[PDB]
Amino acid sequence: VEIPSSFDSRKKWPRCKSIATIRDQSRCGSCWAFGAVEAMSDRSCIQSGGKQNVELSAVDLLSCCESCGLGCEGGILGPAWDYWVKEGIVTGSSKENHAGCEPYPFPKCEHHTKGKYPPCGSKIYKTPRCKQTCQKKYKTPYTQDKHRGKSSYNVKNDEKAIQKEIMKYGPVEAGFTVYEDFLNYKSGIYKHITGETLGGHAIRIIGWGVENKAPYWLIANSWNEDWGENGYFRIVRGRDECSIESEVTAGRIN
Ligand SMILES: *[C@H](CC(=O)N1C(=O)C=C(OC)[C@@H]1C)[C@H](C)NC(=O)[C@H](CC(C)C)NC(=O)[C@H](CC(C)C)OC(=O)[C@H]([C@@H](C)CC)N(C)C
Ligand code: NA
Structure with missing residues (x-):
């Protein structure tokens, strides 16, 4: 397949309102869970x-x-x-x-x-208990509200393979290494320039583009709409910047 110079999942599948929804993980290191349920929501609708x-x-x-x-x-x-x-x-x-x-x-x-x-x-909440109970106003029992996938897989650490996967099957979850300068990000195309490691973060890749000849990934963060570019950021694409191309995971409902 020929890969376009730019792609935005929000524009290919606009009926799927999850794709353009920015969430907030709050005072909790639940990024791993947010990138997962966001991309699973997107893909359940798309597929x-x-x-x-x-x-x-x-x-x-x-x-x-x-x-x-x-x-x-x-x-x-x-x-x-x-x-x-x-x-x-x-x-x-x-x-x-x-x-x-x-x-x-x-x-x-x-x-x-x-x-x-x-x-x-700087303080984080205790992990909530596994309650297995829908809120009182929701009239489907917990077990009967479950949405499942059919397969899960890691995506190859190859730019074109990641682009092909997103444009055919939808947004993916991805990990990357967070350095201190990421916390200063306001806008534009991120790359690591200063600061030491703060560990790993998990986000949702929705597309890609290029500006002033600089290729980027378009990514939804889970830090609400005030953070970055209305909740999104861009990061250098094609150079495994902060390991962005090396920890991609997704799955399909069929
Ligand atoms: C979500 C990301 C996040 O909350 N934050 C940042 O990225 C920067 C922040 O503040 C400055 C906040 C805290 C969480 C914390 N990140 C993760 O869950 C990563 C996800 C991968 C990138 C897929 N993983 C971990 O942090 C990982 C999880 C354990 C294996 C359960 O733990 C660590 O890397 C270490 C340590 C256990 C490694 C052996 N530790 C728990 C931070
Ligand atoms: Na902002």
């Missing part, structure tokens, strides 16, 4: 021709997956996608929207940036 148009629950995955790591203390991508295949994930929106089976329990906050929400600060 079902819009029939499964849902917002999957970050808290169900965060609180119930035993193999995915340490909940709000951080986690692992492969097992999150395996959990979606084997057990599935229920629906649930943000705390503020309070929709679906298990909405997120934690409020929006600013992640080392200025804006209209309280600062997140």
